[PDB]
Amino acid sequence: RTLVLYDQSTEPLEEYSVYLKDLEQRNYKLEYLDINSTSTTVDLYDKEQRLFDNIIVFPTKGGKNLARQIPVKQLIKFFENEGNILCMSSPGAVPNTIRLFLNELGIYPSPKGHVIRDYFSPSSEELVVSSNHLLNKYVYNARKSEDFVFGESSAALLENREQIVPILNAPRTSFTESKGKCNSWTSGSQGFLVVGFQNLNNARLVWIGSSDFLKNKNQDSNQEFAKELLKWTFNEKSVIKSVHA
Amino acid sequence: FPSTAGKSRVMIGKVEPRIGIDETVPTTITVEDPNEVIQVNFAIESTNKPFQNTLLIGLPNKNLEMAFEPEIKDNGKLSMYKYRIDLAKLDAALLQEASRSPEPIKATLILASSTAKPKENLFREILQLNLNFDVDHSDSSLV
Amino acid sequence: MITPLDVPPLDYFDEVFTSENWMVRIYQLKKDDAQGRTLRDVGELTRSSTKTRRSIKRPELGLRV
Numbered sequence: 425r426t427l428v429l430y431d432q433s434t435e436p437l438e439e440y441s442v443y444l445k446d447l448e449q450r451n452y453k454l455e456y457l458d459i460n461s462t463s464t465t466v467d468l469y470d471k472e473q474r475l476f477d478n479i480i481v482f483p484t485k486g487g488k489n490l491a492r493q494i495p496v497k498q499l500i501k502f503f504e505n506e507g508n509i510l511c512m513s514s515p516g517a518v519p520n521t522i523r524l525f526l527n528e529l530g531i532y533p534s535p536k537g538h539v540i541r542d543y544f545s546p547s548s549e550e551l552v553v554s555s556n557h558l559l560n561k562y563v564y565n566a567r568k569s570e571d572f573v574f575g576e577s578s579a580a581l582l583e584n585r586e587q588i589v590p591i592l593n594a595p596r597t598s599f600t601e602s603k604g605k606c607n608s609w610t611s612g613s614q615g616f617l618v619v620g621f622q623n624l625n626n627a628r629l630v631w632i633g634s635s636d637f638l639k640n641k642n643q644d645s646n647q648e649f650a651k652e653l654l655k656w657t658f659n660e661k662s663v664i665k666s667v668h669a
Numbered sequence: 670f671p672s673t674a675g676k677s678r679v680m681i682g683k684v685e686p687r688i689g690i691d692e693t694v695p696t697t698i699t700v701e702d703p704n705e706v707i708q709v710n711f712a713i714e715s716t717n718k719p720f721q722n723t724l725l726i727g728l729p730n731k732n733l734e735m736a737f738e739p740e741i742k743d744n745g746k747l748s749m750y751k752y753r754i755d756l757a758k759l760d761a762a763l764l765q766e767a768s769r770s771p772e773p774i775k776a777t778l779i780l781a782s783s784t785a786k787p788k789e790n791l792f793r794e795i796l797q798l799n800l801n802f803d804v805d806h807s808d809s810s811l812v
Numbered sequence: 813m814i815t816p817l818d819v820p821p822l823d824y825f826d827e828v829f830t831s832e833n834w835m836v837r838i839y840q841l842k843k844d845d846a847q848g849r850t851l852r853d854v855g856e857l858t859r860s861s862t863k864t865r866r867s868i869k870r871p872e873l874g875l876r877v
C-alpha cells in the first residue's frame with residue numbers, strides 16, 4: 425500500500441530504517457523502487473482505482489529517473505484522488521519535479537545552493553532547532569523541551585492558503601545564505617522548516633526541509649516528532665468524522 | 670552608529686524605547702530627532718563590523734516580522750546605516766494586526782559576523798513604536 | 813466574421829450540451845480546485861504548458877499570517 429522512492433546515489437536507504445521498520449510494526453505493506461538503478465516505470469492504479477495509498481520520496485539530486493516514475497501531472501492526479509505524500513529536499517538534493525509540484529501547492533522551497541545559516545544557536549555543528557517553534561498542536565504537541573537536529577537545512581516560503589498547515593519554523597535569526605550573490609530567500613520566522621498540506625479531499629502531504637532529520641543517527645532527539653509526523657501524514661493521527669446531522 | 674528612519678505614514682506616532690532585558694552587548698541608546706520629512710532616530714550600538722545585518726519590524730509573539738536590509742557607506746573608521754521604513758508600504762497583515770491587537774510594533778536589530786565569539790553578536794529591540802489610526806477590516810486579513 | 817483567435821478560452825465553466833443547430837448552449841460550473849488554487853492558473857498550466865518559466869525567482873509574496 426506504501427511506496428518508498430529512494431535513490432542510492434545520494435543517500436542510501438540503509439540509513440532510514442529506524443522509522444521505516446516501525447511502519448511495518450503497524451499494518452503497512454511496503455514496496456521499494458530505487459530510481460537510480462531501475463529502468464521500468466511504476467504502476468499507481470489497478471482498474472482506475474488506487475493501487476497505493478501512500479508515497480515517500482527520500483533525497484534525490486534530480487533527473488529523468490523520478491521524472492519518469494512520477495511526473496508532476498501524475499503526482500497531482502494521485503493527490504487529487506485521496507493519497508498522502510512525504511517529500512524532503514536538502515540544499516544538496518532538490519528534485520526539480522518535487523519543487524514544481526510544491527510550487528503548484530503554494531509551498532516554495534529554496535533552490536540548490538541556498539542553505540539556512542543560523543547563529544545564536546545551541547551548537548555550531550548543525551542546525552539545532554528548539555521545540556519552541558512547533559506551530560500545530562494537532563500534529564505534534566511538545567511535552568518537554570527538546571532540540572531537533574537538521575544537518576543541511578532548507579527553508580520554504582508559503583502563500584496564505586486555507587489548506588497549508590505550518591508545522592515548524594525557522595529561528596528568528598536564521599537566513600538563507602546563497603553562495604552566489606542573490607537576495608536571501610528566507611529571513612527569520614517567515615521561513616518554514618516543516619510544512620504540511622491538507623487537500624480538499626482530506627489528502628495530506630508533508631515536506632521536511634532537510635535530509636538529516638529522518639536519519640538514524642539523530643533518532644534520539646527526533647524519535648518522538650518523526651513518528652507523530654508520519655502518523656499525521658498518513659491519516660492515522662487526527663481524522664474527524666461527522667454523523668447524524 | 671546606524672540611524673534608522675521611518676519616514677512616516679501620517680502625523681508622527683510615538684516611540685516606547687524600552688529594552689527591559691539582560692546585558693547583551695549593550696551600548697549607547699537611541700536618540701530621536703525630528704529634522705525633516707524623515708524623523709531620524711540615531712543609535713550608537715557596539716559590534717559594528719557584522720556580515721549579516723537586518724532589522725526585523727513586527728510582533729515576535731505572533732511571528733509577523735518583516736526584514737529590512739541597510740545600505741552601508743564607507744566614510745572610514747565609522748559604522749553608519751540608514752533603514753528607510755515607509756509606514757504606508759508595510760504589509761497589510763501587519764498594520765491590521767497592530768490595530769486589532771493593542772500590541773506595539775517592535776523593531777529589532779541583528780548584527781553577526783559568523784565567526785565572533787558567542788555573545789559578541791547583537792540581537793536587541795532598539796525601538797518600540799505605536800500607532801493610533803483607523804485601520805479598516807472591511808477587506809479582512811488572511812489572519 | 814469570426815476567427816478562432818477572437819474567442820478566449822473558458823477556464824471556469826464546462827460545456828455540457830449544445831443543441832443540434834447551436835441554438836441553446838448549457839454550461840456547468842466546475843468545482844473549485846482541490847489544491848485550492850485559482851482555476852485560471854490551472855487552465856494556463858494545462859494550456860500553455862509547452863513554454864513555462866523554467867527560471868527560479870523569489871515569488872515576492874506577503875507575510876504569512
Ligand SMILES: *[C@@H]1O[C@H](CO)[C@@H](O)[C@H](O)[C@H]1NC(C)=O
Nearest residue numbers: 431432433434459460461462
Ligand atoms: C546508480 O548509482 C550507482 C552508484 O551507487 C551506480 O553504480 C550507477 O551508475 C547508478 N545508475 C545508473 C543508471 O547510472
